[PDB]
Q: What sequence folds into this?
């Protein structure tokens, strides 16, 4: 019955988005798609030439081979000069094809640039959360790791409790309780950041149990935002956990430890370790 | 007499913006415009060649057909080699035309990319607003829906009352009262967000009536901002309502409901439902 | 002796930035510069060919005309086929020239796009400021006008007093007192926004006079920021005033007024009117 | 044992990122790399043609010279018309090569644009920090200088103490104490900004000494952010200092001074001067 899946995406069911598709497909699929149109549009132009007749020098009438490779030479602006258009109709088709060719190039280039500036937030989230005595006070925790060689500026993470509540009006709704963190922004997120919500008497989760979290349909959202180093621009990552993914009394293993010389170093093997 | 129309744009009358125009026209209009210049500039170059005389091989003197398709072959960098320039003047025109051709390409490409990164904030606003007992306390509400498959990060919406007020100096002005919301930022805007302003004793709208809202020229602005999922960058949407578009005692129908299996799903048919 | 000029730029004297230059020059200058290199690089390549000898078909040995137009045909990828390279040296120069040609295109295109996305904050600031009785309380004011057809989202303006002060340590410095405004953010900046700082007992400028403002070297900075409508991205504008540019008891004329039908309309003639 | 090096990067040891590499290499290296692939891909295509046999007009069978320069003429879309493909296989290779050529162009262009919009935060940080009596109160200071002709909008700097602390649970961790500054945001960063943290009774560093700072492993981070003038977009700079890089009782020399006429001017020689 869980609200938001672990990836942050929700279990809410939806009752031709080409934009989204073109940007999300893997690079091999994209190249295939680009090529697919490229071959198809050249084929449509080849058919347009032969529908005018044998309007191509070096071409045999009815030969798609000659028409297609002439279309390519035209669209691609090669213009070898062996296969050349004949008549006003063919020359008009060439004028339209050349416009298409260099215009499409512009379209492809904007796609490629946009696929290059994909905010690949190389952040790793802990498999589960813990609620343990910190300073002797019970505290809710999970952690993040920067997998990229790079660093993140003004990294602001929020621990958001999304739980179902009822009003005196009778309306049932889910409200987003932003939790008070020990650190809400790590101006430099470069290592592994353990995010903590101390459970004080003001805390929205004060006094809750495994049982009451389930009964309140308690769902914990982790929203991560930050400005990448090599990139410049923002990167965003999300993860969500249910009450079932919380470890009572749980303690994480510090990923940072000291080398023989005395220098501190990070072991990401120890990331999912409690 | 309403201040801001429902789209957010105002009824304030204005007493050659090509930039704006080129970006706002529909894609068919844009393609036509791009083509329009393309044909016109090739025509101007064709005229420039014939003004030099018969400076083109394969061309008849006075033939615009030959000059135009030679211009296209030049601007588009095809260079078949059938129609070729004759003399220093023609060759200088070719050098300028080639610069124009590849330079314009750059201009078109920047237009196309900019038309692709149009923040299409796929947000749907409720037709009207309501003021109903929430928790038994009267509360002002309206709602938003994400029509895009995607999600929105750090979505901050503001309910802004723009009403006319008078000072002891005698100046009449409209001030923007930002209203205290139950949720002012939905870190993840993925479903339908019902925005609420509880009308408490501190609220700027405490104790107002349909009558007094009209007399105070009360106008409600809804400003929506958020960072798109597939996009990365910000999207923005706005809507405005007058006192006449407010429903006293009105109650929205929850768009979220439970499937046979038990999973929650959203019915956007029920969006404009009170 | 004034700190910051009216444009926001300072009177502080500086005791080959091509980037900045290429973006700031007017469009005619930019086109001339682009053309300038284009002609120069083609000339350098033409010289490179003739330094190899008569390595061009249709060319006379020693003819720069033939070499230059062959260079253009190569760099621009025309490849008519009349003037063609001879030998491994010429063909190597062609391979380098073709790389240069299409690579430079990429360079030019990035310049053009960047010159297109110049945040042209079409904001107009009032010539002077005023300090007048508002609600009977003395208040410091100036105003802004959106000259663009478009609107601005989350427009946050700050009235910053930059005045010289001295410490018990003896250090003299200028500090940036951010002033409490009646409206610090106009979520929708579409018309003319009059920015006001009420001079209360907590205000940093409480009780100052024309005389004491001059003696404290009081300088008022206006920083404007907002997210453009047709653009999407941020626009920024700045203006600064000295104590000498402040009008004591001054009152602006409202730019908004009512048409015969009853609709409100804006008269920007009345902008610089006190 | 110092946590973060003076550049902001940390001494934490890491226990094929082409993206990062392509953007970070110097311009000469990038041009060499672009050229490197360009030559290699043309060589692979040349080999592909000769593997089909003597499928090129003007070419000698087995001549890589002819095949390579034909490949260049094809990939670059020159199409002189001297060397032309023979057969369906060669013509198919040409169709793929032309796609590769103009597609790669798009790839290169996105790289070049991205290398152009490198946020070169031309900010200079003071070599060391000082802790001196300001207003008679001990205060922690360092300073920034804008080396670029340009200015920076909404410049927000944070003085972050990263020190090791221990909990009642026994966990040892480093926490990021954001220090209260005299100025935390210089809406216009144009000159030299001296950042100060007054050491009051609430300050996290109140009462610390050179000795106790070392023993608490006190590390001072300086995070700088701002929106560039000619750029538009954000720029970011960072620097970090250890307790060993702090000067007790230290006083900076003002970089701003008055010319003969009376105008204020900045001497950056005096930047690293205490
Ligand atoms: C265009 C581009 C390249 C080459 C790259 O590596 N990435 C980034 O990291 C950003 C910020 C962008 C844009 N892209
Ligand atoms: C360039 C581009 C493409 C291909 C697209 O779908 N959209 C977006 O969603 C963004 C953010 C941009 C830019 N564009
Ligand atoms: C690329 C471009 C165009 C065509 C334009 O009008 N402007 C804008 O308004 C923005 C935001 C950008 C970028 N440019
Ligand atoms: C594209 C570009 C150019 C030409 C330049 O100088 N810089 C900047 O300053 C920005 C903001 C960008 C992008 N680039
Ligand atoms: K060509
Ligand atoms: K040719």
A:
């Amino acid at each position: 019955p869980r609200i938001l899946n672990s990836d942050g995406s929700s279990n809410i069911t939806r009752l031709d988005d080409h934009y989204h598709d073109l940007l999300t497909v893997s690079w091999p699929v994209f190249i295939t798609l680009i090529t697919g149109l490229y071959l198809v549009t050249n084929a449509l132009f080849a058919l347009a030439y032969l529908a005018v007749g044998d309007v191509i020098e070096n071409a045999r009438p009815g030969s798609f081979t000659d028409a297609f490779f002439f279309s390519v030479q035209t669209m691609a602006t090669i213009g070898y000069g062996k296969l050349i258009p004949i008549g006003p109709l063919a020359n008009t088709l060439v004028t339209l094809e050349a416009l298409v060719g260099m215009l499409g190039l512009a379209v492809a280039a904007s796609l490629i640039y946009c696929r290059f500036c994909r905010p690949t937030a190389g952040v790793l989230f802990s498999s589960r959360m813990v609620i343990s005595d910190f300073e002797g006070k019970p505290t809710l925790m999970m952690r993040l790791a920067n997998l990229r060689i790079e660093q993140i500026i003004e990294a602001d993470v929020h621990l958001v409790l999304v739980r179902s509540e009822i009003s005196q009006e009778g309306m049932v709704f889910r409200r987003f309780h932003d939790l008070t963190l020990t650190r809400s922004r790590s101006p430099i997120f470069s290592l592994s950041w353990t995010v903590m919500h101390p459970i004080d008497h003001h805390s929205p989760i004060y006094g809750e149990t495994d049982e009451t979290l389930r009964n309140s349909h308690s769902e914990f959202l982790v929203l991560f935002t930050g400005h990448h180093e090599a990139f410049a621009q923002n990167v965003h990552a999300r993860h969500a956990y249910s009450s079932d993914e919380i470890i009572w009394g749980g303690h994480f293993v510090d990923v940072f430890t000291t080398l023989p010389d005395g220098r501190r170093a990070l072991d990401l093997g120890k990331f999912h370790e409690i």
Observations:
- DSSP finds five helices and 13 strands in chain B.
- The CA atoms of residues 126 and 265 of chain B lie 19 Å apart.
